[model samples]
Target chain A: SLPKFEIHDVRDDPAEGTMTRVAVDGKLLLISQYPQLGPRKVDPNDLSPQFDADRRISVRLRHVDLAYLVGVCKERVPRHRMETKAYTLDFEKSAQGYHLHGKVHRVASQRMEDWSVKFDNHFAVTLEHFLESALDESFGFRQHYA
Target chain B: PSLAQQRARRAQLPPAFDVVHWNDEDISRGHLLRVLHRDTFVVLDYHRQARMLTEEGNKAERVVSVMLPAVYTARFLAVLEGRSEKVEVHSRYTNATFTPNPAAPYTFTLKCTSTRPDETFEWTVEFDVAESLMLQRFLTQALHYNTGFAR
Candidate 1:
């Protein structure tokens, strides 16, 4: 089992979409944010607002954010089962500094498409789905509680 | 034009272009696998496996340890523990086979020890899967690269 962290705040940021303030063992880390608001294609065929699974999702946060994301995933997914077959958290050094990368294997979602879903809590729901798929059973991530 | 000239021209033409994936020569091009024990991913190309040598330059043979995708893991684990003798993996690719080890708590080894490489390849895989998915996600997708089999 991994150590737990606390979420200090989650608010809309004009510069950064949704800024989530996070900390581990009472130490302030960094601001985790969503993709800056922009124009995107809305598929009438699919409803789940897709989080770009290809990006690092390291919007200025550190390794704590990655651990936090995985923790939330384990909380949501029972026995660490995910819709996508796989997920990964990798690292690299960019021109700026070290960056953390995360990705989910491509898989067909079980959820059907509907226009109403667009109006729903699409971002929240989509983020939830992404985390669940990101943190799944196996390796050191197997869920021991359930 | 004559048939021979036409055939030669067609051969010179670039192979059927599929802009989606990077490597078009091999149909099993973009496939990747995650070592469950290591929590890391690697390319699934059999040809590449022969190239992964140890630091001493000795050819490194993989035990073929991979994490089964959660979607199918339950079904597979159930079938594996049912004493079914052999688990036949009939995917779009090869019709592979597996024999679970009942002797060890978590040991991964070939059931029938063989001298032939082809025979060993067929029987030695600890698990198997298809083109669409499995294990930890590929580095290309995580790194957002045009290809998966690289640094």
Candidate 2:
């Protein structure tokens, strides 16, 4: 049988967008979004913004920000019980529109719990619906905590 | 194009390009210069200069320079192109790591530490997606010119 993770403490804000607290077995994960700002005129060399012309959003996972938040949770959260599965997020642009592509991969093996997951083996969807809606929906509140 | 023609084309590649560098808590602008020595090997030279006021109420300047060889550049490129999230390159005088910034998808950070005993130096270089592509192409050409590797 396959194991499943749970999502709770779902909140949203006008400026910060949505944030969802997820439980991956024994580990905790926080998924959040922020408004992608354009490069400032004062700093012409600043290429921090991801997009060139299109206005888009930034969706990120807190576990990936290891430098800022040190040792928050188990490195790699187990999404599946049998095969090794982990969560990932990416920004993709296509003919349809911009998308925050999220996926779970069934990897070959786990060397150690260090947040590294190999992109091998086959897997199925678990959080596509939630991610897609998070990009399209709007929340009433202006700020949300945790 | 023939192999000789390709090599000739690479020989005429640009020597330098501008880059934005992050030095600890401050940001500075700089350039990466490509140098060919004795028409045999290639090296990348990074240079940046910033002016500041000294604690004794005098004008002062800080200069930072890093020399990266073709072999180390190739390793750096491999980590950027690979699935691994981080890669570290250590040598007798320098230690550097190529890591992606999780806050922004299009940006990556290169943190370096100088192992010289006389002067301790530490800085981080930030590269956007486009800048990363520039480094990739520049290093690819440099490696091919130095080692005849097609990649």
Candidate 3:
């Protein structure tokens, strides 16, 4: 299994889209958030969600919202210059109903179609069916015990 | 026209055409068995000795091996198995005693060994030299009606 990451959110630029806050897994292995409110050159040491599979989530600032966060997770991903953005999102059968699975993404739902992330031999596991349905948008991402 | 002139004209006509098969194994056309009988062969008493050896199960076995090639010699091979050879009606009819009046013609014979004392099968098979061969032969042999064995 690949390293688990939380669906960390970045503050949405009012210019980009409404509903800036994103839902994230309850705990993240390593997470940071610095909402600059605009597209700037992403940097390391700047806010990016960090994750761990065996520990309680490190960052806890509701103000550092799980809606949408951008800027590089250089510690999470090293070589890149500009920070890639991510959002913590959910899927639902009806708008009023609860989340089917507390799903999230490192990318926006609109960008997912452009991202085209497909895995091999997952005959029975589509992206929506596997990560979104198999596990809830677990905020306790790294909080193994709690 | 005079009879002498008619006979001369008929003499020039070609001989009759016939399609014939004979059981000379793998014999090609223009190859016929030498009928000279220069080879003297053995004849066995297979009929008498087989019953004599009743205790031995291979009695018939021993008898046939010793008897076959000797009994079914090449001289009678065609006579025994040819589907299409026709007899020369006046065949080898040169026995002067019988020929002056030609009392009986020489019958061709093959040897079929009997299994017992009462069983003697000296096989003789022949076909009539008629237009329809076996059909005529059966009429002559079985029905005893002479089915025109012309030249």
Top candidate on TM-score is 2
lDDT of 3 by residue, B1-151 (tens): 5644533443342211111223323322111111111122222222212222224442221122121222233323334234323321111211010011122122222123333344433222222221122122212221111122221
Model 2: how far residue A96 lies from native, Å: 12
- The DockQ of predicted model 3 stands at 0.00
TM-score of each: 0.24, 0.36, 0.14
Off by over 4 Å in 1: A1-125, A128-146, B1-48, B52-123, B126-151
- 1 against 3, candidate with superior TM-score: 1
Which ten contiguous residues of candidate 2 chain B have the minimum total lDDT? B52-61
Task: Point out where model 2 deviates above 4 Å.
Answer: A1-146, B1-14, B20-44, B51-62, B149-151
Model 1 chain A: ten consecutive residues of lowest lDDT:
A111-120
Residue pairs in collision within model 2: none
Docking class of 2: incorrect
The window of 10 residues in a row where model 2 chain A has the poorest summed lDDT is A137-146
Error (Å) of candidate 2 at residue B29 is: 7.3
The positional error of residue A90 in candidate 3, measured at the CA in angstroms, is: 9.8
Query: What 10-residue stretch in candidate 1 chain B is worst by lDDT?
Result: B13-22
lDDT of 3 by residue, A34-141 (tens): 223445336788664332222221232221121111101111111112122333332222222122122123322333212111122332123223233212222111
Error of 2 at A12 (Å): 56
Q: What lDDT score belongs to each candidate, Candidate 1 first? A: 0.30, 0.39, 0.24
Worst 10 residues of 3 chain A by lDDT: A67-76
Per-residue error for B54 in candidate 1, Å, reads 14
- For every candidate in turn, the CA RMSD to the true structure comes to 18.9, 19.9, 46.0
